[PDB]
Design an enzyme around this catalytic site. Structure first.
Site, short mmCIF file in Angstrom:
data_model
loop_
_atom_site.label_atom_id
_atom_site.label_comp_id
_atom_site.label_asym_id
_atom_site.label_seq_id
_atom_site.Cartn_x
_atom_site.Cartn_y
_atom_site.Cartn_z
CB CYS A 160 12.84 -2.56 3.14
SG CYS A 160 11.40 -1.48 2.92
CG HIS A 201 8.34 0.50 0.21
ND1 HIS A 201 9.56 0.01 0.06
CD2 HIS A 201 8.44 0.41 -1.24
CE1 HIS A 201 9.80 0.28 -0.74
NE2 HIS A 201 9.22 0.36 -1.64
CD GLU A 248 11.99 -0.17 5.68
OE1 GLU A 248 12.08 0.76 5.81
OE2 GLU A 248 11.96 -1.44 6.00
CB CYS A 274 10.22 -4.28 -0.66
SG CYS A 274 11.21 -2.71 -0.26
ZN ZN Z 1 9.97 -1.28 1.05
#
Ligand code: ZN
Length: 199
Positions: free
Chosen positions: A106, A70, A72, A101
């Site tokens: 995350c 991701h 992030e 997520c």
């Molecule tokens: Zn994530």
């Protein structure tokens, strides 16, 4: 109390790239993450010009060992390259178009970040909700216990974030026809999750 707030006529996303990207009402494209770095000085927040940036999800090279990651994560990956100076306070603003997520993957990552660097105020802004599961709920709670500020993108933020994350070179933002609609809708959702008492 100092001249005026600067812009950012550097190399930002194209006027269209931003709009089309944040095209209110998506379903599948590419999660967006715009991080803004600012320093806190006596209530005086000084927005940095050459320190902010934006990222985008990535999942087309999981064969090179870089499994789907991701934005992030790939984002925080630059923190070690900035060698922040806890000497003072900081303000990291997160601008996400896609909900989080695995609240543990995350959010967790962030949680530890604060538990170790609570000297920085992290603001989370969810512009659009879209994930694999509704787990986004636990993400809102797990994060709440972090102290971070979780809220839904607002019109005022759209104008600022726009001229801020765009090479508008001095151009206004173009809002769609139906802000009170999508705004009241989304905002209504968050509140719901924030409503776990009274009845
Ligand atoms: Zn994530």
């Amino acid at each position: 109390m100092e001249a005026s707030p600067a812009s950012g006529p550097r190399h930002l996303m194209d006027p269209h790239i931003f709009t089309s990207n944040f095209n209110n009402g998506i379903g599948r494209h590419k999660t967006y993450l715009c991080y803004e770095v600012e320093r806190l000085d006596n209530g005086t927040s000084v927005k940095m010009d050459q320190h902010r940036g934006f990222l985008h999800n990535q999942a087309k090279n999981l064969l090179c060992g870089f499994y789907g990651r991701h934005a992030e994560l790939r984002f925080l990956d630059l923190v070690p390259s900035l060698q922040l100076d806890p000497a003072q306070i900081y303000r990291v603003t997160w601008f996400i178009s896609w909900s989080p997520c695995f609240s543990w993957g995350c959010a967790g990552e962030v949680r530890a970040f604060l538990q170790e660097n609570t000297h920085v105020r992290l603001r989370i802004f969810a512009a659009r909700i879209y994930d694999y599961d509704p787990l986004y709920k636990e993400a809102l709670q797990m994060l709440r216990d972090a102290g971070a500020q979780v809220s839904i993108m607002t019109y005022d933020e759209f104008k600022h974030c726009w001229d801020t994350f765009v090479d508008h070179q001095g151009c206004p933002f173009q809002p769609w026809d139906g802000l009170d609609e999508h705004s009241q809708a989304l905002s209504g959702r968050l509140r719901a999750i924030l409503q776990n008492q009274g009845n």
